[PDB]
Each structure stands twice: as C-alpha cells, then as structure tokens.
C-alpha cells in the first residue's frame, strides 16, 4: 500500500484507486501530474503517471477523480481542451435521478449505469431500467408504469376527474381539481367567477349582459343545456339512458369517495368522504354525475333528444326567448318534433365545455 | 467571488413577450453552465432552463418548452432568456444561477433576481 509514484507509504483509503488501472496514487503527485500535461502538454498527454495507461471513455471515469482534486482554474481547461480537441461540444453531463450524481456520459446504449450507485436508467425519461422498457418508447414505458401502480388504481375514478382540470378562461390556470357538487368557481389569481362545467361567467349584481334576463340583480350564471349546472339535477339513471342510447360504456362498480377536495386551513388536501352508494362505480352521488356527465360532454351528446313537451318548452322560451305555441293539426309527437328541430338547430350546445 | 446581476423584468400584458439579461463576473464564463430559476409567489425555486457552457445543449422545464429559448454570450459573460407567450402562471422572480458540476448541486450560486409579472 505505497504511491506508485514517489513511493510514499499511506493506507489504501489515503491515496485514490484510478479505476482504468487500479495503480494507487497519492493526492498530491496525482494533482501536480495532471495540471502539467493540461498547461504545457496536450489533451493525448494525460496518461497515467505510473503506468502505460480506441474506447475513450476513459475520460469520462477521469473526469470524477478530476473533478475531486484539482483545482477550478484546471479543471476548467481540461473541459476546454475535452471539447476544443476530442468531442468539438460540450460533454453530455447526466444527473442520476436516484443518487443525483452528476457524470459524462458518452456511450451508444439508450440505457446508462450511475457511476455512484450502479442503478441502469434510460437517458431520454431518466426512469429506472427495466426489461420491458426494451424496445418501447418512454411514453409506453412509464404508462406501462402508471398501469401497474396498485396505489394508482386503488383510487379509482378519482384520477379520471382530477385528471380532467378546471381552467380559468382569463387566466389560464390549470386546476388538477374535481368540479364537485357546486359549479361556482372563484380564480385565486384573477378573482375570476365562472362555472367550472361551461366556463361562463357568473355576472355580479347589474353586470349580466344577456337580454331578457330577470335576475340581473343577483349573483347568477347562464348555462348551455349540456351544462353540468342542469345535468345534476338529473337521475344516475337518465344520464345513463343517454349514454346507452349512443352506445357510450361507463363504470357502475369500483374498477368514503376518495375523490381529491381543498381543506381550508390557516388549502389542505382532503378526500370527499361522501356515501359511495352501490352502482355509481364507489365515487359520491355528486361527483359520479361529474363523471357521467364528462362522458355525456365529450360524445356531444345532446340531452335535448330526450326532452318531452314541457322540457322542449322551457328550453324554447330560455334559449330562443319565445314562448312555444302549438299550431293547429298538430299532435304531441309533432308539436314535440318541432320544437327539437328548432332547438337543435338555432341554439348549439356549449361552446366552451371542456370535451 | 462570484457575482450575478439580472435584468429586463417588469409588467407584461398577457401573451406578450420579454427577454431578461444576466451579467456574471467573478469566475470563468466559459468554464461551466448556467440556469435560470423562478421564485412564484409563495413558492420557493423551480428550476426553468439551463444551457451548456459554450451552448451545445439546452435544457427546458416543461411547462416552457416551445415557449422559451435560453442562450449566452461568452464573449461577454452574459446569460439571455427569451420569454414569449407570457402567462399568468409565469409570475415570478426570475434568479441568475452559476452551474456546478459537484453532487446534488446544479448550481452554488444565485443571483438577486428580476421580478416579472404578467397582467390579468
């Protein structure tokens, strides 16, 4: 246990193991030979002092015990002379995502070993190595990954509508957030009221623009027909008569509701807790509407195809302004099927519901 | 010792564009990378861009990718970021970091900062 070097006698944890030829050299003969042969020699010149030693990634095995004892001013001119003279770039440095050891990396393999903690990960995602991300793309890989997290399943539903953010429409904040039972939604940047199931605002007292209005002295909102705001005032199982009439699947049993809500503190994250009833796929009343209705929503399914005389009536003095009047020969299905086509056609469904 | 001066933050309309400037001394501006790190309100340091030393690679978080463009000069010691498209999520105070290549430590030194701010 001496330096090959100048033969001074230290313990083996004294000196520093050159991992291309295991011949130990003590810290300061291996300082001084390596500044020389980068001050007055060439980059070709750093070969071992001791020893006699086309794979050049010995640099990058180099480039660590270089970095340890050496000064700045040096060390900074063997980056100059690696990329002025070998590489004609900068060296790609890689941070282990595990050790946060960074290293030189210069190989052919997708896959790359931490020269600190052994552990193979790929160098495009910077995730573990496995063998089933052999021959996949990343996005396959860690989607194979999401698909296979027991915690990630366990929680259901809850990640399809957390999934699913509320965006402010002026300020374009993403919320990973479920609607819930009220669609009122304040923007803590833009102090913005909006529904979160049309994204139309909610006009304060004498701001509403809309005509024939007669709430415009109140805090209140208009809604498209496909809105959440009126699709949760109907039955789990009307929601589904219009899923199932346009053959659109949906959960019924589990794949407190664990669904993802703020807690006001001095916001802290607490789960809904709500009844899970049997039949609406383990989620709340509330929120497993949420998810019939983003299904109904991203189909363009249009509620109105379900609508009898009196609903057809409604929507036609709400979105057209006109109360409906039956004209003479007309039957129940006809005074009906009239009513539709003009809904259907003059009054589009919402323009700004998120799809 | 090391010095770092940012500069160009101010009050920007929504989807507008800005470009900040750093002016570094006190070490060799060849000799390593340089970042730039945010500070948005309440939050601590999220790491933006970082660049190569003489520029071979540059690297984006992703939520500004396609939307900012990290460049230096070495010939003047002075990093750039170009910022375009602008949104509100982006006020923050932008920080001048020095790379490092040493463990756990993508940079040791951080400026002052600019703040930057963007209308609603």
């Known amino acids: 246990q001496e330096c090959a070097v100048c033969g001074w006698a230290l313990p083996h944890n004294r000196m520093q193991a050159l991992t291309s030829c295991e011949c130990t050299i003590c810290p300061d003969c291996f300082r001084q030979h390596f500044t020389i042969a980068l001050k007055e020699k060439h980059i070709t010149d750093m070969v071992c002092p001791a020893c006699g030693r086309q794979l050049l990634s010995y640099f990058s095995t180099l480039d660590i015990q270089l970095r340890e004892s050496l000064e700045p001013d040096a060390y900074a001119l063997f980056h100059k002379k690696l990329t002025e003279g070998v590489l004609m770039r900068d060296p790609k440095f890689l941070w282990c995502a595990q050790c946060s050891f960074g290293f030189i990396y210069e190989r052919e393999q997708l896959e790359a070993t931490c020269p600190q903690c052994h552990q193979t990960f790929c160098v495009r995602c910077k995730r573990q190595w496995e063998e089933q991300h052999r021959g996949r793309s990343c996005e396959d890989f860690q989607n194979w990954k999401r698909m296979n997290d027991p915690e990630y399943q366990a929680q259901g539903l809850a990640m399809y509508l957390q999934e699913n953010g509320i965006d402010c429409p002026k300020c374009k904040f993403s919320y990973a957030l479920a609607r819930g039972g009220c669609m009122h939604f304040h923007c803590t940047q833009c102090r913005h009221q909006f529904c979160s199931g049309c994204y139309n605002a909610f006009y304060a007292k004498n701001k509403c623009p809309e005509p024939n209005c007669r709430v415009k002295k109140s805090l209140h909102g208009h809604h498209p027909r496909d809105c959440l705001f009126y699709l949760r005032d109907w039955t789990a199982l009307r929601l589904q008569k219009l899923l199932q009439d346009n053959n659109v699947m949906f959960n019924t049993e589990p794949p407190g509701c664990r669904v993802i809500e703020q807690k006001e503190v001095p916001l802290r994250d607490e789960a809904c807790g709500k009844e899970t009833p049997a039949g609406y796929a383990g989620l709340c009343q509330a929120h497993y509407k949420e998810y019939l209705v983003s299904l109904i929503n991203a189909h363009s399914l249009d509620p109105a195809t379900l609508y009898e005389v009196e609903e057809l009536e409604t929507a036609t003095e709400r979105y057209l302004h006109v109360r409906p009047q039956p004209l003479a020969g007309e039957d129940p299905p006809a005074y009906q099927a009239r009513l539709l086509q003009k809904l259907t056609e003059e009054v589009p469904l919402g323009q700004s519901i998120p799809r | 010792e090391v010095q770092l001066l940012e500069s160009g933050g101010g009050l920007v309309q929504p989807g507008g564009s800005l470009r900040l400037s750093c002016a570094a001394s006190?070490?060799?501006?060849?000799?390593?990378?340089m970042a730039w790190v945010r500070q948005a309100p309440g939050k601590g340091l999220e790491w933006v861009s970082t660049?190569?030393?003489?520029?071979?690679?540059?690297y984006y978080a992703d939520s500004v990718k396609g939307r900012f463009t990290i460049s230096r000069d070495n010939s003047k010691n002075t990093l750039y970021l170009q910022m375009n498209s602008l949104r509100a999520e982006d006020t923050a105070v932008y920080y001048c970091?020095?790379?490092?290549?040493?463990?756990?430590?993508?940079?040791?030194?951080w400026g002052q900062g600019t703040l930057v701010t963007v209308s609603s």
């Open positions: 006190g070490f060799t501006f060849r000799g390593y990378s």
């Open positions: 660049i190569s030393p003489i520029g071979t690679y540059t």
């Open positions: 970091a020095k790379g490092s290549y040493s463990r756990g430590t993508p940079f040791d030194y």
